[PDB]
Amino acid sequence: CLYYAYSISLMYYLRAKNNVKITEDIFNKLGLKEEDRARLRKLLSKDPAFTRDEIKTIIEPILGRATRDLAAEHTKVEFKSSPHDTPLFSSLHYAVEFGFKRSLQINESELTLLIDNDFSNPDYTEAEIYKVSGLLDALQEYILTRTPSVIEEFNRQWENKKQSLTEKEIQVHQATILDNILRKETIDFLLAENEKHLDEYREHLRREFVWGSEETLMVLHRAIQGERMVRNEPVYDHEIILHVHRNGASPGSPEMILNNEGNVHWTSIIP
Amino acid sequence: CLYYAYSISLMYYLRAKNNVKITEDIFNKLGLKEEDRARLRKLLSKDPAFTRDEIKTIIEPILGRATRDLAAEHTKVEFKSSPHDTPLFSSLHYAVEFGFKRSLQINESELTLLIDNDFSNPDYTEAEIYKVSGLLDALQEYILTRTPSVIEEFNRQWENKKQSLTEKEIQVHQATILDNILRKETIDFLLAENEKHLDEYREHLRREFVWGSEETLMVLHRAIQGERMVRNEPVYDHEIILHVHRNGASPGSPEMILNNEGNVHWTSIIP
Ligand SMILES: [Pt+2]
Ligand SMILES: [Pt+2]
Ligand SMILES: [Pt+2]
Ligand SMILES: [Pt+2]
Ligand SMILES: [Pt+2]
Ligand SMILES: [Pt+2]
Ligand SMILES: [Pt+2]
Ligand SMILES: [Pt+2]
Ligand SMILES: [Pt+2]
Ligand SMILES: [Pt+2]
C-alpha cells in the first residue's frame, strides 16, 4: 500500500519540520490545488498520531492520488533524461530482444542464433510495462513489420565493420552490433508518435490497480526531493533521509520511515 | 579463488539487504569478534563496488578466513549427521575398498576377488581427503592390521545368512555382505580416537593451500543459511538464492553470483 504509506509518512515529516517553505515547495511539486493545500495544513497543526478519519478523508484522497501521479510522471522524465539506465528500458529491451529472436527465425535469418533469450528470466517476467494494456500486442506488430529493416541494418553495419577472423571473435561482433541495433529499437518503440507508448506507460502507472513498487518509491522520493542534474551539476531541493524497513527489520537519522512487508503491504512508521 | 569470491559476494548481498539482524545472525554463524564485525559494518555504508583496498585489507583477511573455517567445520557436521551421503564417505570408502583388496590378497584370502577397484576412477582420484597429511599412511596401517578381523567378520556373517545354491547369486551375496563391512570400516576409521582422522581432514580444509571445491561451496552456503534438519523438520535461517556462472554463462532472482572458471579461478559478480 505504497502511496498511502508514503503520504502518511510525508505528513509526519512536514508536521515535524513546521516550515511553510518546505511545505509549500513540496505542495508545488505535487501540483495541489490551494483548496486541498488547506485541508492538509489543518492537519499540520494540532500535533500530539493522525486519526483513521484524517487519513481516509484528507491524506489518502489528496496525497494518494498526487504522489502516484508524481511518481508516474517522474518515471517518464527520468527515462527521457537517460533511458538506458532505467528499469523500463532493460525490462522492455529484454522483451524486444525476445520478440526479435522469434521474428528473426520466423523470417529465416541466421541472426536468431545470436540471441540467448527465453523470456523467462525472473528479473523481467513481472515488469509492469508488460501489463500496460495492448502494449505487447503493438510490440509484436512493431517487431514483425520492422524485422526486414533490422536485418538490413545489421547487414549494413556488419559489412562496414569487417577488417585474424577467430570465427568466434567474429560472432562476438555480430552479437554486439545486433544488440546496439535492438537497444535502439527499444527506445524508438517508446518514443514513436510523440511518446505514445511512453505516455501509455505513464497512464498505466497512474491507474490505481497498479501496485507501487520499491522502484517507483525511489522515483517518487527523488521527485519529492527534486533531485536534478543541470548545466552550469547535480542539484537538490530538499534532503529527506528515507529508510525502508522490511518485515520489521531496520537498517544519518531518518525523517521518513516505511516498512515493506514482502512487497505486499506498505505501512509507514513515525520516527 | 572461492572463499575470497564468496566473501565479496556475501558483502554485496549484505549491503544490499540492509538488515542489522540478518547481518548479525550471519556474523554469528561466522563467529566473528566484534572488533572485526565493526570493520565490516563500515563497508556496508556509502553503497551508492568495493575497492581493492577494502577487499585485501578488510574483506579478504576477515571473511576469507572465517568462511573457510565455517566451510571446514560444517564439512565435519554434515558427515556426523549422515555420513554415507557425504562425498568424504564416498571418496574415503573407494580408497578403503581398494586398500582392502590389496591387503586381503596379501593375506591370501579369496575375498579379494569380490572387490572391483583399480583406484583409478577419476571421480575419486583427486579427493582432497587423500591429500590430508599422513592420512593414507594411517589408512594402510589400519587396513593391514584390521584385515584378519574383517575376514573373521565376513565368515561369521556369511555363515549366518546361508539359506538355494544359485551361484550366479552367491558372489552377489558375499559381495554385498563384504561391502557393508567395508563401509563400516570406512566410518570407524574416521570416528576413531574421538574423530582424530575426521578432525585431521577438518584441519586440512582449514589450511589455506587447500583450494575450495565447488562441493565445499554448497556446504558453506548451507551453513551460512543455517540449513538443518530438526525434530519438531528441515528448517532454515535464511534463504539466499545463490547462482554459479560457469565460464561466464548464466543459469528466482539471485542474491549472490559466483563465476567458476573451469575450477581454477573464482570471481564474484554483483547482481
Ligand atoms: Pt496504495
Ligand atoms: Pt530500493
Ligand atoms: Pt534507489
Ligand atoms: Pt533511495
Ligand atoms: Pt547527472
Ligand atoms: Pt581463495
Ligand atoms: Pt557447485
Ligand atoms: Pt548444491
Ligand atoms: Pt531431516
Ligand atoms: Pt546453487
Author numbering:
A (entry chain A), B (entry chain B): 16 to 63, 66 to 180, 186 to 254, 260 to 278, 283 to 302
Structure paper excerpt:
Here, we describe two novel OTU-like DUBs in Legionella – LotB (Lpg1621; Ceg23) and LotC (Lpg2529). Whereas the overall fold of the catalytic core of LotB and LotC resembles that of other OTU-DUBs, both showed apparent differences in the helical arm region, which has been shown to serve as an S1-binding site and interact with ubiquitin. The structure and sequence alignment with other OTUs clearly showed that both LotB and LotC contain a relatively long insertion between the Cys-loop and the variable loop, compared to other OTU members. Based on the catalytic cysteine and histidine residues of the two OTU domains on LotA, we analyzed the sequence and found that both OTU domains of LotA contain the extended insertion between the Cys loop and the variable loop (179 and 178 amino acids, respectively). Together, our results identify Lot-DUBs as a novel class of the OTU-family with longer insertions in the helical lobe region.
Consistent with the recent evidence, Lpg1621 exclusively processed the K63-linked Ub2, while Lpg2529 showed activity against K6-, K11-, K33-, K48-, and K63- linked Ub2. Based on the sequence analysis, we identified the conserved catalytic triad for both LotB (D27, C29, and H270) and LotC (D17, C24, and H304). While LotC retained its activity with the predicted OTU domain (7–310), LotB lost its activity after deletion of 50 amino acids (300–350) located at the C-terminus, beyond the predicted OTU domain (11–283). LotC lacks this S1’ site, causing the VME group between two ubiquitin moieties to be unable to reach the catalytic cysteine. In comparison, the helical lobes in LotB and LotC contain 183 and 210 amino acids, respectively. For LotC, we identified several hydrophobic interactions of the extended helical region (Tyr119 and Tyr149) with ubiquitin (Ile44). During the simulation, the C-terminus of ubiquitin (Arg72 and Arg74) formed transient electrostatic interactions with LotC (Glu153 and Glu245). Remarkably, a single mutation on E153 completely abolished the catalytic activity, which indicates that the electrostatic interactions are essential for the correct docking of the ubiquitin C-terminus into the catalytic pocket of LotC. The NEDD8, which has an alanine instead of Arg72 in ubiquitin, showed no modification toward LotC. By contrast, most of the enriched proteins from the inactive LotC pull-down were non-membrane-bound organelle- and ribosome-related proteins (RPS8, RPLP2, RPS27, RPLP1, and RPL13).
